[PDB]
């Protein structure tokens, strides 16, 4: 279910930084970015309404690590939930445990963030959580395992974690290695090349 | 012969019973007269796990309804007036 | 009834019993007797009755948890090989239209000297083995295992791929 493949390969095809390599140094390059996604990648792919309408959601996935069978469900949920289905969808995607982890900078990438959550390196309100898909409520508190706290990985992660854009809707710490989800992130305090109207549009027919 | 008994609806390993008035000859999950309260054999310890409409139960009893052993082992377990 | 030493009792084999399977009330030990030797070969029952197909196969994967013969079904679904007490491959044909299978079945010659010999041990290495010389590799009624070789030299080189296990016949 996990990707398990070249990350930069996806980064160049989506044409933006998917934060897959985040780690020590960020903002990509050193891959020949965007100029050769394939062997033919130097091509000038004029693409269909459908094509972009795909590339959008298909990027939103890769930037998280969720796969289709799940993503669809997510969308369904969003649709069911009153309010803009795009921003709801983003809400759901941002409510994922692994996400809340990478966001709180307990790991370099969201890919690294997963390793922990699955390896039972974290918890919720004090029960340990194995599943990467856990939906994080407000007021919930995620904490690195008391048992394995501050290791050769997560320590170096917190480093540039502090050096990122940093979030709003959550409250982080250093030595406690725990954080609270204060509120569900608004549409305004997160954004990118990401378009909601493209992705909600894709699932219609 | 009317009986107030337990029907097992819950799930594998995690039963959720339901206390219910029914004809004794019927099936456990079969046709019944009405639902009165319920029982939760798990519930952990938080807020809940058993409810019964006692005023109804006694109405049926007085209409000559028998009670299952577990059922009464609920009814007096929840006490009566306190 | 109920039995005493020296009698002969019958049970009900469902892939649980083999040959020489010792049964106690608890004492973990196994009787050093029972021969169990290895088959020669030939065959390819390819069936008249133009199929089915189980009843033939079912017939074969039911005369085979018995001790006489034993089948061999390669990884090409068809191509059914049987091997092979001595040379009386006839009871097979006959139990192919008696017992409870209305099949008919005949024979041919098959490029198989061995026999084979049915292998397993540690992982990964085996998956590299069950891949390189798989051409070439079979699977039996009872869901394992076996090779099937063309001669003796091609038998030696196979094992010589090495170093993972016997020999194994076990009936």
């Amino acid at each position: 279910a996990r990707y398990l493949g070249p990350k930069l390969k996806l980064s160049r095809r989506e044409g933006t930084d998917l934060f897959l390599k985040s780690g020590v140094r960020a903002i990509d390059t050193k891959c020949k970015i965007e100029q050769a996604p394939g062997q033919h990648g130097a091509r000038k792919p004029r693409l269909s309404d459908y094509g972009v309408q795909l590339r959008e959601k298909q990027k939103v996935r890769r930037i998280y690590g969720v796969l289709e069978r799940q993503f669809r469900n997510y969308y369904k949920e969003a649709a069911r939930l009153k309010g803009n289905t795009g921003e709801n969808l983003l809400a759901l995607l941002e409510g994922r445990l692994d996400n809340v982890v990478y966001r709180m900078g307990f790991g370099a990438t969201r890919a690294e963030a997963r390793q922990l959550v699955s390896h039972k390196a974290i918890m919720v309100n004090g029960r340990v959580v194995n599943i990467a898909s856990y939906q994080v409520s407000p007021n919930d508190v995620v904490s690195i395992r008391e048992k394995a706290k501050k290791q050769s990985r997560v320590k170096a992660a917190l480093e540039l974690a502090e050096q990122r854009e940093k979030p709003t809707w959550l409250e982080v710490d250093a030595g406690k290695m725990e954080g609270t989800f204060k509120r569900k992130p608004e549409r305004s305090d997160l954004s990118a090349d990401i378009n909601e109207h493209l992705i909600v549009e894709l699932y219609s027919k | 012969m009317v009986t107030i008994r337990l029907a097992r609806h819950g799930a594998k390993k995690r039963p959720f019973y339901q206390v219910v008035v029914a004809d004794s000859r019927n099936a456990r999950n079969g046709r019944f007269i009405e639902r009165v309260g319920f029982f939760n054999p798990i519930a952990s310890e938080k807020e809940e796990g058993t409810r019964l409409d006692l005023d109804r139960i006694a109405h049926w009893v007085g209409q000559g309804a028998t009670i299952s052993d577990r059922v009464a082992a609920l009814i007096k377990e929840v006490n009566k007036a306190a | 009834e109920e039995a005493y030493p020296g009698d002969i009792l019958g049970l009900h084999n469902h892939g649980t019993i083999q040959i020489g399977d010792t049964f106690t009330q608890g004492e973990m030990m196994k009787f050093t007797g029972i021969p169990n030797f290895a088959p020669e070969l030939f065959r390819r029952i390819r069936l008249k009755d133009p199929l089915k197909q189980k009843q033939l196969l079912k017939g074969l994967v039911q005369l085979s948890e018995e001790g006489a013969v034993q089948v061999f079904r390669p990884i090409s679904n068809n191509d059914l090989i049987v091997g092979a007490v001595g040379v009386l491959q006839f009871d097979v044909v006959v139990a192919r239209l008696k017992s409870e299978y209305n099949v008919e079945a005949v024979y041919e010659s098959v490029n198989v000297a061995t026999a084979r010999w049915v292998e397993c041990a540690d992982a990964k290495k085996f998956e590299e083995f069950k891949r390189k010389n798989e051409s070439q590799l079979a699977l039996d009624g009872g869901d394992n295992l076996a090779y099937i070789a063309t001669s003796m030299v091609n038998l030696r080189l196979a094992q010589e791929r090495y170093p993972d296990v016997q020999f194994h016949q076990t009936r």
């Binding site: - | - | 133009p50 679904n77 068809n78």
Partner: protein
């Protein structure tokens, strides 16, 4: 009924047995059916390495 035999080459002969799939071919009218390769008495296309699901060939030892 008549049925189509896909791929290059087949072991089929006088009697044999097959499993008829269905779906037509409009080159040869009257053939509304396909025989599933590698099913029953049918052998799969020899040496086929691509889209082997159809034409019924097992992994050629990756």
């Amino acid at each position: 009924v008549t049925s189509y035999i896909g791929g290059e080459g087949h072991n089929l002969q006088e009697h044999s047995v097959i499993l008829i799939r269905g779906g037509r071919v409009k080159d040869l009218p009257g053939v509304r059916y396909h025989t599933v390769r590698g099913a029953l008495d049918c052998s799969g296309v020899k040496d086929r390495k691509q889209a082997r699901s159809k034409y019924g060939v097992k992994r050629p030892k990756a």
